[PDB]
Write a protein that binds this ligand. Structure first.
Ligand code: CLA
Ligand code: CLA
Ligand code: CLA
Ligand code: CLA
Ligand code: CLA
Ligand code: CLA
Ligand code: CLA
Ligand code: CLA
Ligand code: CLA
Ligand SMILES: CC1=C(/C=C/C(C)=C/C=C/C(C)=C/C=C/C=C(C)/C=C/C=C(C)/C=C/C2=C(C)CCCC2(C)C)C(C)(C)CCC1
Ligand code: SF4
Lengths: 99, 196, 33, 42, 67, 153, 734, 80
């Protein structure tokens, strides 16, 4: 398997899990935690004028609600698992358990 | 129905649930939501272990393995599974892990999204072919049978794991063969009481 | 004159700067607005 | 003797009697079994 | 009606700032005036750090022990 | 031979320590008449030393490179006599004491002024209470099960 | 705000006495207690102060670099490192006599100089930095960073950039950035340095800023990384014959995991440290992207604490409400921070000696002792401060009604159990450790050392045997070849690790014995007792049965009067103050143990420690009396030597350690009634009625004098032991 | 200078006033105790801080309560 094939397959199978399988769980956990609450109020509600949850980057169209940040997240996991595969395969290491 | 006659039953263990023999010494199922989670996880552990017991004994009787020999091939780089002698062409370590993850994650995460606590354990329908659910007077008997055989299989899996721990390089049918050859002098006693 | 520079700075930091700082901070200690 | 047994019942007199007896016990044991570092009697 | 415990009733203390907190005591006397804020005089077996065995306590800073 | 320690009956440094101490005593024994009392005390100390080293030889003590008996307190049966058989013999005796002095404190807890029995010990009551702690472990066990070991405030 | 010098406090400014001066010095950095204070202004002052501290840190490092560049023999040290003395800085003392100039001329210098026992030579030589112009450039850059931190601290005090209170309370974005960038990108950048510079610098060529864009750290270059063939970065590990600083026996690998030491330097491989910092960079960059900041993903630390309530209530309400008692409380933040910092400082000390990272730092023996002693005393102090700030949190910042029944209020619910079981553990340890030490003292006294109670540390020897140390015959996971641990690692790092740990000459997992057991239990006594004092002062910070209103009196207050039997030293501050004594004792034990074990290893007679560490007259004779000969002979009547300064500092530390006893033993009241007589004498002495104080000269306050005695005590402790540990380890050098 | 605040647990025994060496305290009429009096503290500016008032207060913890605070020449016990 060439490394381009490995990277592409693992990334595709990561944001496939993110788009279809592990979407409702991730999003319901997100809604459960919701926001970082500083003394009941959020970080932006209490002030600080910089911790506003960006919506111009999260408004992207999808029937299920996939955004570019989930594309980065599932896909960072993708490239990470791909490079784990690639390095672990390219390293000719013998575990040699019991022998 | 009591795991130990004479011990008082917990008030939350009435006997109505399948396999409710009142066994809660440590007091884990005192709150009901944890008890429903525990029932679901008990049935999941049970079903996996009792599917596993054939997958441990059968390939050791005829499949020419001993249920850990079926794993050593992945511990050595270069070499794939001998599914009944013939090698499998689906790769050896990484791609089987990919298929396992991508399949059982989907299955178990479509299992996770169930909200009805009875379908969380006893879904039925597509998982109930042959119509062995249309008569609760026997479905309760069958649920008790599932729980009982599953707890038996869980204890048998402890037997597998610990007979593997005591004797590192054997299998359970070899243990039973040793116990059928010389039953007295080749039992657990040489390990609970190590001579040195 | 680079072996002479310690002779310039060790007094200037150790005798002169302490006199400066002690005087200035003693005035700051006793000031009243 | 009344009120002498109350004095000998007092904490220092009673402590010196108890610790003199106890110290003599330990001292005579160490005379009998000197230089002990193990308990070999099982 | 006489308010509070009795002149020999056993009582325990729920006052956080007392030496005898969660420790039982004997009610010496209860001042029947409804203007003294701390009427319940309690007697304790063991002295505090001030070598004092008694203090006046409130009605809600006290709990009639069931012994 | 645990922890890289030769036994003391086999350790050459242990015998060398014995011989060194014995020579150190004999060099002090020469200054006195062979029948005199200091000389006899030194000879008694010499036999005490010799049988001390013999007993540390026979009781399974392990000697290091320095040549001194080390104690293996881990739990090996061969060396239970170094720590555990004494240790239980401590926890018994110690637990005698605390089970006595506690019981006494419970027996003089219900007095009018119970502090004048702390400083003036009732020898009859204390002598009745002292041997209650002989078989103290069963009393402490049962009082733990009956809840009488821990006050309920 | 106020009028006189404590402008931050109009209570000390309106103090006619000299207490004004002292307390305005002391309470200057206690921004929480100043007048007209707000949480916003408190946070902003803290931020600017952090900038000032970073500026001073970079300035102090620039000073080190400048004084090694200007007055150091660093260009000569990088030629023959293990036989040329470092030079910290020059010395121009106009009180020096000509013999002292003849004596302090070391390292092949033009004049008198000071020997760098700090290890900056070894560390700088290991990370590159060959010529003195490199150190000059580094000092210039750190002066620039000092000015940058000063600029930032001034800029973030102006109104246009004064950050808001809710910005310092963003406890998710800060963790995200600090894990990802401060911890991860910084470890990644240190890997970049170790790969582009320090590994080429160890292997000859000098990759500097002018020629680092046109040299390859690996001959392929980013093919292995992008193509995933990362094993190509572990091809030529410069095996077993590499001369550090020259290309003889060098290699091409940059991230090989070898384990163990260099053979020449007896330090870790720069390829190992490059791969290390890379690995933890990946781990910290992953761990950064955890806390939700702005982007709709991540955790909220609130709903992690709020959600970690166990059913059954064994903890109680769990961590329900603990985000607010840390986010809104800077003393909880500071206590946790100093706790972690003391733990990892002790870890730095315990790993830098046994796993030395710098070239030829295990070969200079005074450097290792100075470093271990330094970081361990720093760690003990930082730990004492962690606990002191926990006490200050419990007094100033703890809100019981906000955190009812949670995991933090349950501390105060059963604080007596914690304090009493710490008072059991410390009491047990002291009784038995001292009993065995005194038993062995008496056995050696009575000439029967065979009767000693030499309890072998089987449980640490078993761990050493679980790491490959074949010196006890336990045959455990890494000492046994037939094991899962000696199979899954026998191809990667266990070769080097085994060949390093089995070497009896290095500090890696030293061969221990019964003296090591006994002194480890003394160490446990010290840790448990310092912990007892500090935890007891933290949990009795809000109040006790003797003073339930202690929270109303603040952290530092003298007492509560002689009433109620007597309330001397009842504050949580006083608990801290007594715990500094027990801390200095504890670190003195750990460092005496370290220094004697190591000086006996370096000398060669490990048998000396093994036969003499079990009884305390062995510590007094064979360590303190024996190793202090060359020290106290630093200046004798017929001459002096290079250790004259350490003899003088030894006696100086003795003098101030004894002067602290004046303030600790002798208390106030005697001194106020003395200074009353002195004030009478000044007001009735002719030609001195002309001169009159403006500050009425009162004696020192009580809590102040406990602090001043503790400061003299600790200064003397530290200076005395520094002098002894450097003079003894530099008088012979192993 | 100092802050001698008292609390309503006072029983009117008049021992803090009789211990006070600076006349900080003085009994006033009150209706909260059997003795029908309570110990005020007008002359807090004369308080040295000796806490003889609370080394003589026979309550469970204390009624009179000295909180040490800004120290003046009267509160630093200075005859010069
Ligand atoms: C969840 C239960 C479970 C799990 C995890 C496994 C897992 C495994 N089985 Mg087992 N097995 C199971 C149930 C299970 N089996 C049951 C219920 C049966 C009875 C029908 C068997 C009968 C069986 C035989 C006869 C053999 C295995 C073998 C194997 C191994 C290779 C499978 C492969 O590559 O073929 C996957 C191919 C297509 C899907 C693998 C470790 C083989 C092995 O390694 O033994 C030597 C083998 O020969 N299994
Ligand atoms: C019911 C499951 C089961 C079965 C049939 C066996 C059977 C056997 N075991 Mg295994 N074993 C089990 C569970 C089981 N074990 C568990 C749970 C453990 C964990 C501690 C072990 C640990 C273990 C070791 C370490 C060794 C054996 C050995 C043996 C053999 C000799 C018997 C012996 O030494 O006594 C061991 C007996 C027990 C530990 C009792 C557990 C089983 C009882 C009967 C529980 C009740 C279960 C159920 C109600 C009845 C089912 C019976 C049914 C199948 C007819 C034999 C083949 C030895 C061997 O082969 O050599 C040996 O060295 N076993
Ligand atoms: C905090 C860092 C630090 C420390 C502790 C020292 C310490 C010392 N310096 Mg150095 N120095 C430093 C930074 C530092 N320096 C920097 C950043 C510069 C560049 C401006 C210098 C330039 C310098 C010179 C040129 C000289 C010293 C000298 C000295 C010594 C006497 C004090 C005087 O200095 C004066 C202090 C400064 C110029 C620093 C201002 C900031 C003393 C050992 C003298 C010496 O060598 O004595 C042997 C000396 O002549 N220093
Ligand atoms: C009479 C005794 C005496 C005195 C006065 C000195 C004086 C000095 N020695 Mg020392 N020395 C002495 C005896 C003495 N020596 C003896 C007997 C020996 C043994 C042979 C030595 C060995 C020795 C060595 C080895 C070195 C010196 C050095 C120095 C110089 C330090 C440079 C300086 O001022 O930096 C500034 C001083 C300091 C930073 C230290 C003061 C720290 C203060 C107290 C703490 C901070 C307090 C607070 C924040 C500020 C308040 C003050 C504020 C108003 C400014 C200085 C001239 C060094 C030198 O010349 O290098 C440049 C040096 O390396 N001496
Ligand atoms: C806490 C630390 C510690 C420890 C563990 C020890 C331990 C020991 N020391 Mg050391 N020692 C210590 C502190 C310590 N010492 C200190 C602080 C000092 C200075 C004061 C000394 C000074 C010292 C000297 C000078 C000597 C010792 C000796 C000994 C040994 C005692 C042998 C002996 O007479 O006991 C024998 C046992 C007893 C006395 C206990 C008897 C208890 C009674 C009879 C009741 C038991 C029976 C009971 C009824 C239960 C039966 C069961 C059932 C039938 C009811 C032992 C190894 C001696 C030795 O041999 O050197 C090694 C020795 O010469 N020690
Ligand atoms: C990725 C972006 C980023 C980065 C790099 C930083 C960096 C920093 N911030 Mg933070 N900050 C950020 C984003 C970031 N911040 C955001 C988004 C916010 C708003 C929420 C804040 C809010 C904030 C506040 C409120 C404060 C800081 C502070 C700091 C400074 C920490 C003090 C220090 O030097 O620790 C250095 C510590 C380390 C590098 C960790 C090392 C620990 C290891 C485990 C030790 C062992 C290895 C050791 C390094 C080896 C030594 C060997 C040899 C080289 C000596 C540091 C400059 C503080 C400060 O100082 O202000 C100026 C401060 O008060 N920041
Ligand atoms: C923040 C750290 C950092 C920085 C700024 C750089 C920057 C650079 N690296 Mg380095 N590099 C780093 C970390 C870093 N690297 C790490 C961690 C590794 C180990 C995986 C490498 C391994 C590496 C190699 C092997 C090569 C570079 C090269 C380069 C250059 C071209 C990058 C395209 C550039 C100067 C290439 C180059 O041209 O060398 C200068 C090159 O061949 N780097
Ligand atoms: C990151 C490290 C750090 C930080 C930011 C602080 C910050 C603070 N500490 Mg903490 N502290 C620390 C480390 C730290 N300390 C350590 C390591 C210890 C243990 C020794 C302590 C022990 C400690 C105590 C015991 C107290 C503080 C207090 C304070 C506050 C006021 C400081 C003051 O008045 O003296 C400023 C100090 C000086 C001007 C110098 C004093 C002279 C010393 C002895 C030598 C220099 C301030 C919030 C005090 C507080 O909360 O106020 C009630 C307080 O009582 N700290
Ligand atoms: C050598 C000096 C020394 C010693 C022995 C101790 C001993 C102790 N300190 Mg420390 N302490 C010291 C100096 C010392 N301290 C200093 C200088 C300070 C600074 C003020 C403190 C501050 C301090 C604080 C703040 C705390 C302690 C605590 C403790 C106890 C810790 C538990 C322990 O180890 O008990 C084991 C017992 C001992 C080590 C006692 C040794 C004596 C022997 C074993 C008793 C028998 C002797 C003999 C037979 C009696 C006969 C003599 C006579 C009747 C004729 C213990 C009593 C803590 C505490 O008490 O809580 C438990 C605590 O919170 N100490
Ligand atoms: C007072 C207070 C405070 C402070 C406190 C403190 C200061 C503490 C400290 C603490 C500390 C200072 C701690 C430490 C700890 C430690 C630990 C807990 C450890 C653990 C470990 C482990 C778990 C391990 C493991 C392992 C090993 C063994 C080795 C190898 C690897 C492994 C991983 C396997 C606060 C602010 C908080 C709050 C308030 C109160
Ligand atoms: S505070 Fe003390 S002196 Fe004053 S009335 Fe109360 S009890 Fe009497």
């Amino acid at each position: 398997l060439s490394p381009s094939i490995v990277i592409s397959l693992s990334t595709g199978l990561s944001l496939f899990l993110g788009r279809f399988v592990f979407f409702n769980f991730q999003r319901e956990n997100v809604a459960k935690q919701g926001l970082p609450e500083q003394n009941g109020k959020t970080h932006f509600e209490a002030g600080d004028d910089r911790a506003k949850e960006y919506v111009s980057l999260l408004k992207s169209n999808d029937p299920i609600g996939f955004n570019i940040v989930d594309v980065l997240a599932w896909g960072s996991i993708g490239h990470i698992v791909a490079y784990y595969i690639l390095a672990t395969s390219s390293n000719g290491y013998d575990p040699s358990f019991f022998g | 129905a009591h795991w130990m006659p004479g011990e008082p039953r917990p008030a939350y263990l009435d006997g109505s649930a399948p396999g409710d023999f009142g066994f809660d010494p440590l007091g884990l199922g005192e709150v009901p939501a944890n008890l429903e989670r525990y029932k679901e996880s008990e049935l999941i552990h049970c079903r996996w272990a009792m599917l596993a017991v054939p997958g441990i004994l059968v390939p050791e009787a005829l499949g020419y393995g001993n249920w850990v020999k079926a794993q050593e091939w992945a511990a050595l780089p270069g070499g794939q599974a001998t599914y009944l002698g013939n090698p499998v062409p689906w790769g050896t370590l990484p791609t089987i892990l990919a298929i396992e993850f991508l399949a059982i994650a989907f299955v178990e995460h479509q299992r996770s999204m169930e909200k009805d606590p009875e379908k969380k354990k006893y879904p039925g329908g597509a998982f109930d072919p042959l119509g062995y659910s249309k008569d609760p007077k026997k479905l309760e008997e069958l649920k008790v049978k599932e729980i009982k055989n599953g707890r038996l299989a869980l204890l048998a899996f402890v037997g597998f794991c610990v007979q593997q721990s005591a004797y590192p390089g054997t299998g359970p049918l070899e243990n039973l063969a040793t116990h059928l050859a010389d039953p007295w002098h080749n039992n657990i006693g040489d390990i609970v009481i190590p001579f040195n | 004159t680079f072996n002479n520079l310690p002779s310039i700075f060790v007094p200037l930091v150790g005798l002169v700067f302490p006199a400066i700082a002690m005087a200035s901070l003693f005035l700051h200690i006793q000031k009243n607005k | 003797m009344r009120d002498l047994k109350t004095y000998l019942s007092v904490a220092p007199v009673l402590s010196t009697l108890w610790f003199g007896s106890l110290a003599g016990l330990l001292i005579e044991i160490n005379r009998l079994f000197p230089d002990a570092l193990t308990f070999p009697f099982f | 009606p006489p308010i509070g415990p009795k002149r020999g009733s056993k009582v325990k203390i729920l006052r956080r700032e007392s030496y005898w907190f969660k420790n039982v005591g004997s009610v010496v006397a209860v001042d029947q005036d409804p203007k003294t804020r701390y009427p319940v005089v309690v007697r304790f077996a063991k002295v505090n750090y001030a070598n004092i065995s008694t203090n006046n306590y409130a009605l809600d800073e006290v709990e009639e022990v069931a012994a | 031979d645990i922890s890289g320690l030769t036994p003391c009956k086999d350790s050459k440094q242990f015998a060398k320590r014995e011989k060194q101490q014995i020579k150190k005593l004999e060099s002090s024994l020469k200054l006195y008449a062979p029948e005199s009392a200091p000389a006899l005390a030194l000879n008694a100390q010499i036999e005490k030393t010799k049988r001390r080293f013999d007993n540390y030889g026979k009781y399974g003590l392990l000697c290091g490179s320095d040549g001194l008996p080390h104690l293996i307190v881990n739990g090996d049966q061969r060396h239970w006599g170094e720590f555990i058989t004494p240790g239980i013999l401590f926890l018994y005796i110690a637990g005698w004491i605390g089970w006595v002095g506690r019981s006494y404190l419970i027996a003089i807890s219900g007095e009018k002024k119970p502090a004048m029995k702390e400083i003036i010990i009732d020898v009859p009551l204390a002598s009745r209470i002292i041997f209650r702690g002989f078989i103290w472990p069963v009393a402490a066990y049962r009082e733990f099960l009956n809840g009488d070991l821990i006050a309920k405030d | 705000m106020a009028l006189r010098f404590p402008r931050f406090s109009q209570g000390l400014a309106q103090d006619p006495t000299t207490r004004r001066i002292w307390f305005g010095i002391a309470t200057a950095h206690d921004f929480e207690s100043h007048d007209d204070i707000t949480e916003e202004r408190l946070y902003q002052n803290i931020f600017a102060s952090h900038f000032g501290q970073l500026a001073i840190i970079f300035l102090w490092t620039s000073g080190n670099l400048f004084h090694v560049a200007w007055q150091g023999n660093f260009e000569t040290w990088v030629q023959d490192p293990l036989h040329v003395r470092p030079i910290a800085h020059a010395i121009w003392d106009p009180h020096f006599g000509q013999p002292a100039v003849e004596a302090f001329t070391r390292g092949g210098a033009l004049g008198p100089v000071n020997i760098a026992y700090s290890g900056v030579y070894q560390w700088w030589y290991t990370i590159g930095l060959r010529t003195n112009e490199d150190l000059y450039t580094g000092a210039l850059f750190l002066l620039f960073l000092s000015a940058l931190s000063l600029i930032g601290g001034w800029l973030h005090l102006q109104p246009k950039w004064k950050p808001r209170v809710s910005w310092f309370k963003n406890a998710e974005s800060r963790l995200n950035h600090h894990l990802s960038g401060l911890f991860g990108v910084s470890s990644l950048a240190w890997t970049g340095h170790l790969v582009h510079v320090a590994i080429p610098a160890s292997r000859g060529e000098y990759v500097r800023w002018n020629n680092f864009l046109n040299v390859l750290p690996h001959p392929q270059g980013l093919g292995p990384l992008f193509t995933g063939q990362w094993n190509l970065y572990a091809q030529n590990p410069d095996s077993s014959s590499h001369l550090f600083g020259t290309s003889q026996g060098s290699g091409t690998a940059i991230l090989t995991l070898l384990g163990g030491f260099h053979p020449q330097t007896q330090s870790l491989w720069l390829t190992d440290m490059a791969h290390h910092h890379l690995a933890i960079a990946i781990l910290f960059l992953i761990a950064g992207h955890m806390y939700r900041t702005n982007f709709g993903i991540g955790h909220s630390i609130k709903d992690l604490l709020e959600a970690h309530i166990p059913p059954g209530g064994r903890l109680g309400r769990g961590h329900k409400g603990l985000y607010d008692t840390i986010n809104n409380s800077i003393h909880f933040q500071l206590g946790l921070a100093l706790a972690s910092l003391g733990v990892i400082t002790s870890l730095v000390a315990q790993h830098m000696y046994s796993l030395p990272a710098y070239a030829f730092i295990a070969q200079d023996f005074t450097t290792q002792a100075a470093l271990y002693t330094h970081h361990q005393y720093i760690a003990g102090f930082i730990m004492t401060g962690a606990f002191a700030h926990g006490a200050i949190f419990f007094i100033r910042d703890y809100n019981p009604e906000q955190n009812e029944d949670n995991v933090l209020a349950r501390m105060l619910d059963h604080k007596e159990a914690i304090i009493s079981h710490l008072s059991w553990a410390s009491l047990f340890l002291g009784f038995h450790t001292l009993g065995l030490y005194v038993h062995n003292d008496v056995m050696l006294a009575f000439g029967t050392p065979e009767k000693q109670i030499l309890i072998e540390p089987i449980f640490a020897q078993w761990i050493q045997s679980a790491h490959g140390k074949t010196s006890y015959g336990f045959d455990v996971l890494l000492s046994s070849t037939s094991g899962p641990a000696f199979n899954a690692g026998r191809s990667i790092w266990l070769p080097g690790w085994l060949n390093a740990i089995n070497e009896n000459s290095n500090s890696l997992f030293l061969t221990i014995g019964p003296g090591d057991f006994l002194v480890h239990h003394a160490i446990a006594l010290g840790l448990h007792t310092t912990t007892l004092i500090l935890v007891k002062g933290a949990l009795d910070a809000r109040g006790s049965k003797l003073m339930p209103d202690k929270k109303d009196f603040g952290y530092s207050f003298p007492c509560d009067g002689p009433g109620r039997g007597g309330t001397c030293d009842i504050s949580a501050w006083d608990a801290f103050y007594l715990a500094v004594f027990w801390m200095l004792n504890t670190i003195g034990w750990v460092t005496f143990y370290w220094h004697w074990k190591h000086i006996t290893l370096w000398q060669g007679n490990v048998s000396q420690f093994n036969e003499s560490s079990t009884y305390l007259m062995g510590w007094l004779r064979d360590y303190l009396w024996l190793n202090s000969s060359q020290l106290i002979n630093g200046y004798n009547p017929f001459g002096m030597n290079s250790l004259s300064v350490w003899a003088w500092m030894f006696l100086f530390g003795h003098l101030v350690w004894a002067t602290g006893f004046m303030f600790l033993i002798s208390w106030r009241g005697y001194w106020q009634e003395l200074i009353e007589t002195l004030a009478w004498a000044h007001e009735r002495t002719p030609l001195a009625n002309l001169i009159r104080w403006k500050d009425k000269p009162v004696a020192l306050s009580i809590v102040q004098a406990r602090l001043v005695g503790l400061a003299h005590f600790s200064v003397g402790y530290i200076f005395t032991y520094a002098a002894f540990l450097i003079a003894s380890t530099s008088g012979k050098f192993g | 200078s100092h802050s001698v605040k008292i609390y309503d647990t006072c029983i009117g025994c008049t021992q803090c006033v009789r211990a006070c060496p600076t006349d900080v305290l003085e009994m006033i009429p009150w209706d909260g105790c059997k003795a029908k009096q309570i110990a005020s503290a007008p002359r807090t500016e004369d308080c040295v801080g000796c806490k003889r008032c609370e080394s003589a207060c026979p309550t469970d913890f204390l009624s009179v309560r000295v909180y040490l605070w800004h120290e003046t020449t009267r509160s630093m016990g200075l005859a010069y």
